Amino acid sequence: IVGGYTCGANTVPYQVSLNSGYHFCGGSLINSQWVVSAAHCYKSGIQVRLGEDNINVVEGNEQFISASKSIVHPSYNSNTLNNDIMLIKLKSAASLNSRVASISLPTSCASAGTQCLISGWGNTKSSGTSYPDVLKCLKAPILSDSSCKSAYPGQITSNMFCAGYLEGGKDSCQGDSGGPVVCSGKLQGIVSWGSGCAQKNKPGVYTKVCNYVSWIKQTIASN
Ligand SMILES: Cc1ccccc1-c1cc2cc(C(=N)N)ccc2[nH]1
Numbered sequence: 474i475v476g477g478y479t480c481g482a483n484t485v486p487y488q489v490s491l492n493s494g495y496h497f498c499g500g501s502l503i504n505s506q507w508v509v510s511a512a513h514c515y516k517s518g519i520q521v522r523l524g525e526d527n528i529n530v531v532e533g534n535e536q537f538i539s540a541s542k543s544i545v546h547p548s549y550n551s552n553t554l555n556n557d558i559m560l561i562k563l564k565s566a567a568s569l570n571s572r573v574a575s576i577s578l579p580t581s582c583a584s585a586g587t588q589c590l591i592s593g594w595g596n597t598k599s600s601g602t603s604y605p606d607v608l609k610c611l612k613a614p615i616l617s618d619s620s621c622k623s624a625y626p627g628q629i630t631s632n633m634f635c636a637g638y639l640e641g642g643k644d645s646c647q648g649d650s651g652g653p654v655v656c657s658g659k660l661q662g663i664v665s666w667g668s669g670c671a672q673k674n675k676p677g678v679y680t681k682v683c684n685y686v687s688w689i690k691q692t693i694a695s696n
């Protein structure tokens with residue numbers, strides 16, 4: 474997260490860290506047994522880490538649970554990142570508490586202008602590299618689809634939306650991928666892609682979760 478702020482320990486209880494010997498992507502807990510992340514974060518040997526703040530220090534509220542199965546969206550296209558969403562099932566149900574909680578799925582899509590909360594352990598520099606140990610936060614508005622498509626001609630599909638600031642300075646970044654974009658208490662987006670980080674006229678691109686609620690619900694119910 475670039476241009477953001479330190480969230481505060483466990484202030485984003487649904488935020489998860491995907492670990493394969495190191496943190497490589499974020500995710501969102503949707504119930505005690507399932508996590509939603511980006512399809513481009515897919516990999517074998519995933520360990521889901523819940524209740525995390527400083528990902529390099531065991532602070533006392535963590536839960537480390539291995540994934541038993543991963544399900545990448547059937548229509549995911551790695552070249553364009555269309556349908557960049559995946560589900561991860563925990564080998565054992567997480568113990569839900571104030572520091573480890575699920576985030577609700579949307580019942581409808583969010584409108585442009587709605588303010589959302591984006592979070593992650595990604596790079597905090599727009600130019601260069603610096604990875605935080607604690608969770609970073611960023612409040613950003615959903616941008617109009619026209620401003621989104623103008624920034625990325627022929628690259629935006631109905632399954633993506635942009636959020637952030639066209640002036641630059643505030644954006645998600647490498648390492649935040651797969652993480653949550655929560656608006657009005659609903660998981661509306663997944664950190665997916667963009668151009669560089671916090672660059673002018675190049676806002677972040679997010680997977681439009683509201684288009685996948687039926688798939689998520691049916692897939693979890695059958696697995
Ligand atoms: C997914 C991917 C695949 C291959 C190269 C780069 C990416 C990429 C670009 C961005 C850009 C942002 C951003 N909000 N600036 C966040 C994450 C992110 N991931």
Ligand SMILES: [Ca+2]
Nearest residue numbers: 527530531532
């Ligand atoms: Ca920790």
